[PDB]
Nucleic acid binder design. Structure first.
Lengths: 117, 48, 103, 201, 26
RNA sequence: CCCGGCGAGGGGAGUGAAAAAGAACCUGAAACCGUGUACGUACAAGCAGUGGGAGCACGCUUAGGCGUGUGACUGCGUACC
């Protein structure tokens, strides 16, 4: 029962070189190099699904701050204002509203200003 | 009852080990021997 | 006119005719859902929440599709410790079309 | 416990412990695996590094040359003369308990009855040793893929069946487990039953 | 042809040591 | 029948089911070497990946911010055994 390996080994290597398309030099041509590149791609990919959720919130916060200060209040007080007014609109939605409807956002600044005074 | 409808008693044909065949098997590398020393070697170990 | 509502443990800003992708809802793909907990309604004028949720505010919507998102590969790898894994994931979703914003 | 005769209309009384007992799947399986193992020509070998032709000069030193250390041109890592664990001729046969074999035959035979694959007749023989003669008969009985077991090693019947691929002939003494399974129907003479019965008992 | 095969090749092997130069040296 | 040193090599015709079966002749992988289109790059510094992600080019997204290619900027990031 002699087993020749050529057919199975090609299929296994081809899967890897396929995952490595777009990489530079040997990393998209040479199995040994590609294999290390594809794993590391996976390592980073896992990690940055966690990181992605961090980066977006920092962006929303940063934008609300600018728009809050435009209506004459700091981020820290505006959020506190909304909490004591029991407004629960999150920062994804608030940063969206900060950009596309400045008049609705100003109305949320008053809502949060009334509660805070 | 045909020659392709007969199958073994449950639990009666345990698959047994195949060492040195990679991470997934759980016994790839070293082969359950640990690292180094007399017990790890080819032919290696002490008498009765 | 748009509105804000909660459904997938997350919030969405939507208008009439818009399709929005939510977490899985146990509803057949021709039936109608109502979202009766709405965080904001804005038209010419805009009624926002005080108590969380708008009092008279209801959003009605039609379930259009169930399905799964494109597959993602999970890799774990501990260098020099002869350890690795891989795994697949597809996340469920329901798509709904907003047919009514009731103010 | 009665098996109806095909045409004579004279039912035949048989032991329910032989022809009427439950199917033991694990047991029958074990006897069929061992029969197939018992049929091997365990005939093979390869060459160990001791049996590869060549000499045991070190191809090139324990030190100083830039190459990997070598000892034998017949090392199994080397091109030519590999085969780390070469094969020998070996015996693939397995033991079967007398009782486990008989127990197994009885279970299969009892199933044959239940599945209407066992056919009993008063007589089964042929006139002249012409396969064509048999062929006519088999069509007439509506049989095609069939094992024939007769009372005595009938020769005409034996000769006539040899070129018919879907037909085999057997005396009661020469039966085996896999033949009784390998055909769609099985034909036994009245005499054949009495001999099989005594044998399993 | 055009046999195209003059070479054996049977490539030669040098051995063993021309230079043993130091040093550490002790 | 041509180019061609009365050359090696071609290009034609013809044989041939098929010459990308034509004498380094079944099929005919990658490494490696080539030509052709798309996008990117001469003020920008590093396991060259991944998370964002403007612009351009295709496939209409074949009415709806859809598939692919490429992908400036920026955030996280010291290969394996």
């Amino acid at each position: 029962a002699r087993v020749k390996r050529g057919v199975i080994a090609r299929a296994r290597h081809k899967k890897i070189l396929k995952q490595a398309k777009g990489y530079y030099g040997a990393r998209s041509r040479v199995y040994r190099v590609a294999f290390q590149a594809v794993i590391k791609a996976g390592q980073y990919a896992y990690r940055d699904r966690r990181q992605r959720k961090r980066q977006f919130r920092q962006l929303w916060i940063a934008r609300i701050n600018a728009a809050a200060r435009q209506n004459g209040i700091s981020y820290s007080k505006f959020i506190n204002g909304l909490k004591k007014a029991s407004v629960e609109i999150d920062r994804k939605i608030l940063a969206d509203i900060a950009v596309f409807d400045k008049v609705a956002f100003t109305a949320l600044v008053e809502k949060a200003k009334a509660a805070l005074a | 009852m045909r020659l392709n409808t007969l199958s073994p008693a449950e639990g009666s044909k345990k698959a047994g080990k195949r060492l040195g065949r990679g991470i997934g098997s759980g016994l790839g590398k070293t082969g359950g021997r640990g690292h180094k020393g007399q017990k790890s070697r080819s032919g290696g170990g002490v008498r009765r | 006119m748009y509105a804000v509502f909660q459904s997938g443990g997350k919030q969405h800003r939507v208008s009439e005719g818009q399709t929005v992708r939510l977490e899985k809802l146990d509803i057949a793909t021709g039936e109608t859902v109502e979202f009766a907990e709405v965080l904001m309604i804005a038209n010419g004028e805009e009624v926002k929440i005080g108590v969380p949720f708008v009092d008279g505010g209801v959003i009605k919507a039609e379930v259009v599709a169930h399905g799964r998102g494109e597959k993602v590969k999970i890799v774990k790898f501990r260098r020099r410790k002869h350890y690795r894994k891989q795994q697949g994931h597809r996340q469920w979703f329901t798509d709904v079309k907003i047919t009514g914003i009731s103010a | 416990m009665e098996l109806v005769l095909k045409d004579a209309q004279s039912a035949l009384t048989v032991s329910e412990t032989t022809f009427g007992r439950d199917f033991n799947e694990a047991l029958v399986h074990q006897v069929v695996v061992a029969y197939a193992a018992g049929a091997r020509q365990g005939t093979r070998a390869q060459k160990t590094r001791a049996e590869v032709t060549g000499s045991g000069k070190k191809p090139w030193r324990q030190k100083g040359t830039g190459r990997a250390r070598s000892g034998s041109i017949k090392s199994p890592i080397w091109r030519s003369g590999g085969v780390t664990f070469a094969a020998r001729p070996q015996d693939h046969s397995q033991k079967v308990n007398k009782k486990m074999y008989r127990g197994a035959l009885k279970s299969i035979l009892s199933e044959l009855v239940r599945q209407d694959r066992l056919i009993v007749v008063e007589k089964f023989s042929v006139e002249a040793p012409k396969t064509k003669l048999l062929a006519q008969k088999l069509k007439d009985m509506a049989l095609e893929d069939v094992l024939i077991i007769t009372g005595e090693l009938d020769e005409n019947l034996f000769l006539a069946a040899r070129n018919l691929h879907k037909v085999d002939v057997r005396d009661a003494t020469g039966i085996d487990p896999v033949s009784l399974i390998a055909f769609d129907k099985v034909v036994m003479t009245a005499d054949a039953v009495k001999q099989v019965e005594e044998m399993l008992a | 042809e055009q046999k195209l095969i003059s070479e054996e090749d049977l490539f030669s092997t040098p051995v063993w040591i021309s230079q043993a130069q130091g040093i550490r040296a002790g």
